[PDB]
């Protein structure tokens, strides 16, 4: 049968009226607070334990209501930031600026007042996955950690950097008065003009008005954030940017900080081979332009890399072209035969995003935003951006023109707003990529898809008549091993020097003598002349002047190859890797969508096991999608010395 | 950005059906007492809702009604009549004029 529970007032009413109490009717005491069983012929007590109070809101109740009060705050007050934003970056006047200000002061000290408030909630009594990641999220005091006087001097300094960098501007012994910048001045002198005693002073010259004024800076910089990043618990400050990728509190997933440095350095070591190949196929070119300036055994210098750093290596495209005679994957006359304009390449990504699977595009998009150039009374920023304004906004900022590339950037862009609108649904903490390395790559995945002769021939950018050689392949690997392999050594070298230099591994007068040294012996990298420890050549580059993890480019690149061999598996394309095309396939978009959605309120791990399969990142689509270039690189490679010579230097 | 309309972000329970709430009582999520004041765990019941057609889909402004059909002992009045049944004249037919 069935029994309910019994509840009277005082103990001498329940002996009176326990009589008539069936068995399996649970008493229970209001005023003795006790409970009992009514068992055959008594009623046994049942054994309560201590007194819990009742509870309004539990400590993690608390931080859930005010972590929901704060996103619901943080949303109009972002908003309000990002449209300020938009504006300044559409037209650049004057009360565009202040707004910045107000805006920026707004936020920051909005974020402030709720990272304090959160600061209290403890992280290790509150079980919810979410709220502790949002909270841990929240409570990263970064800078306020230090003093006040430590905190400001830590950031005019950073502010400095970024000034000089800047504003870093050399002048020609020949015309003192005649000076350039780095961009887009020494950039494309470097990248199109053949002239070695041209790019080699400009190198020398940028790195030491540059190098040596950001020297006592960069390294009070370097010792600010390693004692902020101690303040924080941290060991050093590339630890603390390492935090993001930092797993913890889910089992089978966690990941440590210490586990991505390894990872690097084991995709960096298959890569070797590869990239040892590339390196030697540039370097015996560059004797066929240039033989006697460079050496094979020897290195290559940084400035004859196609830049200074030698961050990417497409412009040397044309010095290192392995068949100059036949004709690059370009669709241009498509372009003016049919006038294709930026809304139509857009509103084509937006039918090819349909196609895959993915739904469409909002159109607030289309009337707030612009694509091509917005005449010429105001001036709009032409890098491109996409944008997440929050509360369903999202926008695009570029003046996109029709050039392959552009199509290929507005894919990007589509790709980052996609990820936008996918997490849009988690909480405002958790409306953002897991990492700094998955947005990039599904921007990046789009445009190598959309870059694929498939796709064009699918859309009618590529002529129907259009043949696909073993050269053209071939020239295609070779300039995105340029671009992409290319600057994977780059972002290694630099991500990793960055690291010990803030562990403080790197002694004060020996900085340049490890640096450039190792650039030797690593990566193959050699600087045209000797630089001194008064010079600050790796400090030198946009994003480690501008307080930015440079670890974001070579986990990108990880992650974009393992999505486009993943999508690529789940569309059950036939052929090269490289010729792979995502086109007609919902497959690929259902998938790619199951780990856009979650964001950052799943651990990263778990956002790349929902495609390629596992949480590690190996670079077995980067050799399976070169295979054929490494192949081609042995056979270019066979007789042409591999690797390079630490010794050697151009100076030497 | 339309910031005329609120929205009952916080309330002391559920709704009953058919209520419309307009009290404007400080909620308070902690036990200090906000006091007609809003201080630490003290919020606002109503959020101030922003209107932006740049917003998206899920997120736009949508004027939405609803309606309750409740019919109780008066008799039903709001419907639309068949009427129709054009009137057709000598012929034996079975008529039905209002009743």
Same mark, same amino acid.
């Given at each position: 049968?069935?029994?309910?529970?019994?509840?009277?007032?005082?103990?001498?009413?329940? =002996?009176?009226?326990?009589?008539?109490?069936?068995?399996?009717?649970?008493?229970?005491?209001?005023?003795?607070?006790?409970?009992?069983?009514?068992?055959?012929?008594?009623?046994?007590?049942?054994?309560?334990?201590?007194?819990?109070?009742?509870?309004?809101?539990?400590?993690?109740?608390?931080?859930?209501? !005010?972590?929901?009060?704060?996103?619901?705050?943080?949303?109009? =007050?972002?908003?309000?930031?990002?449209?300020?934003?938009?504006?300044?970056?559409?037209?650049?006047?004057?009360?565009?600026?202040?707004?910045?200000?107000?805006?920026?002061?707004?936020?920051?000290?909005?974020?402030?007042?709720?990272?304090? =408030?959160?600061? *209290?909630?403890?992280?290790?009594?509150?079980?919810?996955?979410?709220?502790?990641?949002?909270?841990?999220?929240?409570?990263?005091?970064?800078?306020?950690?230090?003093?006040?006087?430590?905190?400001?001097?830590? @950031?005019?300094?950073?502010?400095?950097?970024?000034?000089?960098?800047?504003?870093?501007?050399?002048?020609?012994?020949?015309?003192?008065?005649?000076?350039?910048?780095?961009?887009?001045?020494?950039?494309?002198?470097?990248?199109?003009?053949?002239?070695?005693?041209?790019?080699?002073?400009?190198?020398?010259?940028?790195?030491?008005?540059?190098?040596?004024?950001?020297?006592?800076?960069?390294?009070?910089?370097?010792?600010?954030?390693?004692?902020?990043?101690?303040?924080?618990?941290?060991?050093? %400050?590339?630890?603390?940017?390492?935090?993001?990728?930092?797993?913890?509190?889910?089992?089978? %997933?966690?990941?440590?900080?210490?586990?991505?440095?390894?990872?690097?350095?084991?995709?960096?070591?298959?890569?070797?081979?590869?990239?040892?190949?590339?390196?030697?196929?540039?370097?015996?070119?560059?004797?066929?332009?240039?033989?006697?300036?460079?050496?094979?055994?020897?290195?290559?210098?940084?400035?004859?890399?196609?830049?200074?750093?030698?961050?990417?290596?497409?412009?040397?495209?044309?010095?290192?072209?392995? !068949?100059?005679?036949?004709?690059?994957?370009?669709?241009?006359?498509?372009?003016?035969?049919?006038?294709?304009?930026?809304?139509?390449?857009?509103?084509?990504?937006?039918?090819?995003?349909?196609?895959?699977?993915?739904? @469409?595009?909002?159109?607030?998009?289309?009337?707030?935003? *612009?694509?091509?150039?917005?005449?010429?009374?105001?001036?709009?920023?032409?890098?491109?951006?996409?944008?997440?304004?929050?509360?369903?906004?999202?926008?695009?900022?570029?003046?996109?023109?029709?050039?392959?590339?552009?199509?290929?950037?507005?894919?990007?862009?589509?790709?980052?707003?996609?990820?936008?609108?996918?997490?849009?649904?988690?909480?405002?903490?958790?409306?953002?990529?897991?990492?700094?390395?998955?947005?990039?790559?599904?921007?990046?995945?789009?445009?190598?898809?959309?870059?694929?002769?498939?796709? =064009?021939?699918?859309?009618?950018?590529?002529?129907?008549?259009?043949?696909?050689? @073993?050269?053209?392949?071939?020239?295609?690997?070779?300039?995105?091993?340029?671009?992409?392999?290319?600057?994977?050594? !780059?972002?290694?070298?630099?991500?990793?020097?960055?690291?010990?230099?803030?562990?403080?591994?790197?002694?004060?007068?020996?900085?340049?003598?490890?640096?450039?040294?190792?650039?030797?012996?690593?990566?193959?990298?050699?600087?045209?002349?000797?630089?001194?420890?008064? %010079?600050?050549?790796?400090?030198?580059?946009?994003?480690?002047?501008?307080?930015?993890?440079?670890?974001?480019?070579?986990?990108?690149?990880?992650?974009?190859?393992?999505?486009?061999?993943?999508?690529?598996?789940?569309?059950?394309?036939?052929?090269?890797?490289?010729?792979?095309?995502?086109? @007609?396939?919902?497959?690929?978009?259902?998938?790619?969508?199951? *780990?856009?959605?979650?964001?950052?309120?799943?651990?990263?791990?778990?956002?790349?096991?929902?495609?390629?399969?596992?949480?590690?990142?190996?670079?077995?689509?980067?050799?399976?999608?070169?295979?054929?270039? !490494?192949?081609?690189?042995?056979?270019?490679?066979?007789?042409?010395?591999?690797?390079?010579?630490?010794?050697?230097?151009?100076?030497? | 950005?339309?910031?005329?309309?609120?929205?009952?972000?916080?309330?002391?329970?559920?709704?009953? #059906?058919?209520?419309?709430?307009?009290?404007?009582?400080?909620?308070?999520?902690?036990?200090?007492?906000?006091?007609?004041?809003?201080?630490?765990?003290?919020?606002? #019941?109503?959020?101030?809702?922003?209107?932006?057609?740049?917003?998206?889909?899920?997120?736009?402004?949508?004027?939405?009604?609803?309606?309750?059909?409740?019919?109780?002992?008066?008799?039903?009045?709001?419907?639309?009549?068949?009427?129709?049944?054009?009137?057709?004249?000598?012929?034996?037919?079975?008529?039905?004029?209002?009743?």
């Amino acid at each position: 049968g069935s029994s309910g529970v019994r509840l009277w007032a005082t103990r001498q009413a329940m =002996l009176g009226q326990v009589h008539e109490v069936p068995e399996g009717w649970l008493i229970f005491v209001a005023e003795q607070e006790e409970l009992y069983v009514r068992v055959q012929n008594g009623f046994r007590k049942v054994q309560l334990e201590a007194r819990t109070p009742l509870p309004r809101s539990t400590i993690e109740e608390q931080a859930k209501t !005010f972590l929901d009060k704060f996103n619901h705050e943080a949303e109009d =007050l972002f908003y309000q930031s990002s449209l300020a934003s938009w504006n300044y970056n559409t037209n650049i006047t004057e009360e565009n600026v202040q707004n910045m200000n107000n805006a920026g002061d707004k936020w920051s000290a909005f974020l402030k007042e709720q990272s304090t =408030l959160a600061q *209290m909630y403890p992280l290790q009594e509150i079980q919810n996955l979410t709220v502790k990641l949002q909270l841990q999220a929240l409570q990263q005091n970064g800078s306020s950690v230090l003093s006040e006087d430590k905190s400001k001097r830590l @950031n005019t300094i950073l502010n400095t950097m970024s000034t000089i960098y800047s504003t870093g501007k050399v002048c020609n012994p020949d015309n003192p008065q005649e000076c350039l910048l780095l961009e887009p001045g020494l950039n494309e002198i470097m990248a199109n003009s053949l002239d070695y005693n041209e790019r080699l002073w400009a190198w020398e010259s940028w790195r030491s008005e540059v190098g040596k004024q950001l020297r006592p800076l960069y390294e009070e910089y370097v010792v600010l954030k390693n004692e902020m990043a101690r303040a924080n618990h941290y060991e050093d %400050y590339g630890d603390y940017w390492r935090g993001d990728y930092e797993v913890n509190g889910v089992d089978g %997933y966690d990941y440590s900080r210490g586990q991505l440095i390894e990872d690097v350095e084991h995709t960096f070591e298959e890569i070797k081979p590869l990239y040892e190949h590339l390196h030697a196929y540039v370097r015996a070119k560059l004797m066929n332009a240039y033989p006697s300036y460079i050496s094979p055994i020897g290195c290559l210098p940084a400035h004859l890399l196609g830049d200074m750093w030698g961050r990417f290596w497409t412009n040397l495209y044309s010095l290192t072209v392995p !068949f100059g005679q036949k004709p690059n994957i370009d669709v241009t006359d498509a372009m003016v035969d049919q006038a294709w304009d930026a809304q139509r390449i857009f509103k084509e990504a937006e039918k090819f995003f349909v196609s895959v699977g993915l739904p @469409n595009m909002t159109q607030g998009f289309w009337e707030n935003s *612009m694509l091509t150039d917005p005449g010429n009374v105001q001036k709009a920023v032409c890098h491109p951006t996409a944008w997440d304004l929050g509360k369903g906004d999202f926008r695009i900022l570029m003046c996109t023109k029709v050039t392959m590339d552009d199509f290929l950037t507005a894919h990007h862009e589509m790709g980052h707003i996609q990820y936008d609108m996918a997490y849009a649904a988690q909480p405002f903490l958790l409306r953002n990529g897991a990492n700094e390395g998955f947005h990039e790559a599904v921007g990046e995945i789009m445009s190598l898809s959309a870059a694929t002769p498939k796709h =064009l021939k699918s859309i009618g950018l590529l002529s129907p008549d259009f043949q696909e050689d @073993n050269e053209t392949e071939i020239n295609f690997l070779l300039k995105q091993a340029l671009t992409i392999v290319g600057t994977l050594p !780059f972002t290694y070298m630099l991500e990793k020097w960055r690291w010990m230099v803030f562990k403080g591994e790197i002694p004060k007068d020996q900085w340049m003598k490890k640096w450039w040294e190792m650039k030797r012996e690593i990566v193959g990298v050699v600087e045209p002349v000797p630089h001194d420890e008064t %010079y600050c050549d790796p400090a030198s580059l946009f994003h480690v002047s501008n307080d930015y993890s440079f670890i974001r480019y070579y986990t990108r690149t990880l992650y974009q190859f393992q999505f486009q061999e993943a999508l690529c598996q789940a569309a059950k394309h036939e052929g090269p890797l490289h010729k792979c095309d995502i086109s @007609n396939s919902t497959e690929a978009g259902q998938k790619l969508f199951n *780990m856009l959605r979650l964001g950052k309120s799943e651990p990263w791990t778990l956002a790349l096991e929902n495609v390629v399969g596992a949480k590690n990142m190996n670079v077995r689509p980067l050799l399976n999608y070169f295979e054929p270039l !490494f192949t081609w690189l042995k056979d270019q490679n066979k007789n042409s010395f591999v690797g390079w010579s630490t010794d050697w230097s151009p100076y030497a | 950005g339309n910031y005329n309309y609120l929205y009952r972000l916080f309330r002391k329970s559920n709704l009953k #059906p058919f209520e419309r709430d307009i009290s404007t009582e400080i909620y308070q999520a902690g036990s200090t007492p906000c006091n007609g004041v809003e201080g630490f765990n003290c919020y606002f #019941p109503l959020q101030s809702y922003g209107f932006q057609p740049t917003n998206g889909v899920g997120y736009q402004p949508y004027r939405v009604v609803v309606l309750s059909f409740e019919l109780l002992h008066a008799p039903a009045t709001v419907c639309g009549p068949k009427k129709s049944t054009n009137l057709v004249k000598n012929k034996c037919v079975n008529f039905n004029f209002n009743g």
